[PDB]
């Protein structure tokens, strides 16, 4: 496994940060005029990244189409993903209008609501069956239908209504619940267990809209979920599977959203995720 020799090289030489900065240095910088404007400044989780203007998801409202989210389109792999900030209290309604307008089936959440003592997002889904949520500003109802609580994650069925017209759709919320406060998980096994369960739902498949995933600054794990999925997929696609170069794939994703993969631990972990996984894919 070549990636693996290069991986092991790197390990022995203590080069993560140095490879990491290199990618940072060659990354893509694109304008983000929209995020940065006065009116839409209440709409951004702070500290947070900015959606480039060429890639941003447009809301279908005629007065502020703004949301902190991006479309990542991977031509080779035939995968698209929407990456976004954990919603704020003032943007919960926005988040669900995006999910509706974009025909998504799944939402993936890679963090806890509260971490390291602070709120990392607003509690954006109903906690109980009997108590649904109404977002008057975007005219939408959200009802919890079922909950499946497992050892590392939890999966939920949701029913979202478009109150203007009466349509309803099922949305599945996949939540990874055991990403440690500090660092990265030792083994990627649960992480890969989790990615295939999402795959299995149909939420990443071309017959649905793009999967919405949330990455919130100081903690932007989602980059890894996408990076990992795209490489594995390409390994199943090409003739020469050893030609998949995660660095290159990463930079490619970076043309669409700034700063995906937040650290050298996270890059290392990304290699790990893939190597295993590939290995499991061999049997
Ligand atoms: C059939 C599959 N092959 C791979 C890989 C095979 C070999 C690799 C390598 O040696 O680098 S990656 C992943 S899934």
């Amino acid at each position: 496994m070549e990636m693996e020799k290069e991986f092991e090289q790197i390990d022995k030489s203590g080069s993560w940060a140095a490879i990491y900065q290199d990618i940072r240095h060659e990354a893509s910088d694109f304008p983000s005029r929209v995020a940065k404007l006065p009116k839409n400044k209440n709409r951004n989780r702070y500290r947070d990244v900015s959606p480039f203007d060429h890639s941003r998801i447009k809301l279908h409202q005629e007065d502020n189409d703004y949301i902190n989210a991006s479309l990542i389109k991977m031509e080779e792999a035939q995968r698209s993903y929407i990456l976004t900030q954990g919603p704020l209290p003032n943007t919960v309604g926005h988040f669900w209008e995006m999910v509706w307008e974009q025909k998504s089936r799944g939402v993936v959440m890679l963090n806890r609501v509260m971490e390291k003592g602070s709120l990392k997002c607003a509690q954006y889904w109903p906690q109980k069956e009997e108590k649904e949520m109404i977002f008057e500003d975007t005219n939408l109802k959200l009802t919890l239908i079922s909950e499946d609580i497992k050892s590392y994650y939890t999966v939920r069925q949701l029913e979202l209504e478009n109150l203007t017209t009466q349509e309803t759709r099922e949305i599945l919320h996949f939540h990874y619940t055991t990403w440690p406060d500090f660092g990265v998980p030792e083994s990627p096994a649960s992480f890969l267990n989790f990615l295939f369960k999402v795959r299995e739902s149909g939420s990443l498949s071309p017959e649905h809209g793009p999967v919405v995933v949330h990455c919130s600054a100081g903690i932007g794990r989602s980059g890894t979920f996408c990076l990992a999925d795209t490489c594995l997929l390409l390994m199943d696609k090409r003739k020469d599977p050893s030609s998949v170069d995660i660095k290159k794939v990463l930079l490619e994703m970076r043309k669409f959203r700034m700063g995906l993969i937040q650290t050298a631990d996270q890059l290392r972990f990304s290699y790990l995720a893939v190597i295993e996984g590939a290995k499991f894919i061999m049997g």
Side-chain angles (χ1 to χ4, degrees):
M1 216 199 169
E2 240 199 86
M3 166 156 317
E4 171 145 71
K5 288 163 43 158
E6 160 182 23
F7 182 76
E8 333 243 312
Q9 173 230 329
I10 293 189
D11 251 6
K12 68 153 215 34
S13 82
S15 333
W16 294 107
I19 286 245
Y20 182 73
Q21 284 292 325
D22 223 319
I23 302 156
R24 229 150 31 92
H25 182 64
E26 291 290 83
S28 268
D29 186 29
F30 288 105
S32 41
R33 272 136 230 153
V34 201
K36 224 126 257 313
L37 315 158
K39 25 175 249 194
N40 282 313
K41 67 108 16 100
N42 147 290
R43 304 181 163 212
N44 291 320
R45 183 177 289 286
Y46 249 13
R47 322 203 98 306
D48 246 75
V49 256
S50 280
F52 299 140
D53 296 296
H54 79 87
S55 49
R56 100 194 159 93
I57 289 338
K58 278 175 174 106
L59 286 167
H60 301 186
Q61 320 239 54
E62 68 196 338
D63 151 75
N64 197 328
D65 80 351
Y66 186 61
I67 182 186
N68 200 317
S70 289
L71 180 64
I72 280 76
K73 311 194 307 301
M74 312 276 281
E75 190 183 56
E76 191 178 349
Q78 282 198 273
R79 274 268 212 273
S80 301
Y81 330 73
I82 278 162
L83 258 28
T84 183
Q85 74 173 13
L88 298 149
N90 17 334
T91 65
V92 183
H94 302 143
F95 178 90
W96 297 100
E97 150 175 13
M98 163 178 72
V99 147
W100 182 268
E101 291 165 4
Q102 316 284 323
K103 296 130 171 105
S104 307
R105 167 111 199 268
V107 174
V108 174
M109 172 172 184
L110 297 171
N111 69 279
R112 250 104 59 258
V113 138
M114 153 184 296
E115 218 120 305
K116 293 189 217 142
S118 331
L119 307 157
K120 301 260 107 129
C121 66
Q123 166 78 35
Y124 75 84
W125 74 86
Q127 251 141 1
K128 254 194 283 201
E129 285 87 342
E130 44 283 28
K131 320 253 286 216
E132 72 285 10
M133 291 155 121
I134 299 281
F135 310 86
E136 9 190 71
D137 69 311
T138 55
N139 214 220
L140 289 172
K141 204 166 87 194
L142 186 51
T143 305
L144 174 85
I145 300 292
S146 87
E147 176 168 68
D148 216 77
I149 287 194
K150 272 72 256 317
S151 349
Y152 290 90
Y153 69 100
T154 290
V155 195
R156 300 159 185 118
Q157 274 181 291
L158 298 175
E159 176 180 294
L160 157 76
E161 291 217 42
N162 177 356
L163 250 351
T164 268
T165 61
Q166 288 221 308
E167 314 96 277
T168 53
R169 309 195 196 129
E170 171 177 298
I171 315 284
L172 294 168
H173 197 240
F174 285 94
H175 191 160
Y176 197 78
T177 59
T178 81
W179 195 295
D181 269 48
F182 299 108
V184 315
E186 205 145 86
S187 167
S190 49
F191 190 66
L192 296 151
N193 188 59
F194 176 80
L195 166 50
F196 296 162
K197 302 242 163 248
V198 166
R199 265 196 188 184
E200 295 174 10
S201 69
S203 317
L204 296 154
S205 301
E207 37 315 22
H208 299 278
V211 86
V212 174
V213 16
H214 80 96
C215 193
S216 105
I219 308 202
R221 313 186 178 185
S222 46
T224 332
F225 179 93
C226 301
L227 180 61
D229 188 41
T230 285
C231 299
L232 293 162
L233 169 24
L234 319 140
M235 283 168 166
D236 251 340
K237 221 164 109 90
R238 326 163 161 178
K239 265 222 189 156
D240 179 28
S242 79
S243 83
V244 185
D245 195 341
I246 192 170
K247 281 166 275 152
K248 269 173 236 178
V249 171
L250 173 51
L251 280 148
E252 192 66 354
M253 250 165 355
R254 252 188 210 234
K255 278 139 175 214
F256 304 97
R257 192 154 165 94
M258 109 191 348
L260 305 203
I261 296 291
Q262 276 234 285
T263 53
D265 251 284
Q266 267 165 34
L267 186 67
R268 156 190 223 269
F269 181 74
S270 306
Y271 276 70
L272 237 231
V274 175
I275 287 178
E276 317 292 274
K279 280 198 234 167
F280 176 78
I281 306 79
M282 301 162 118

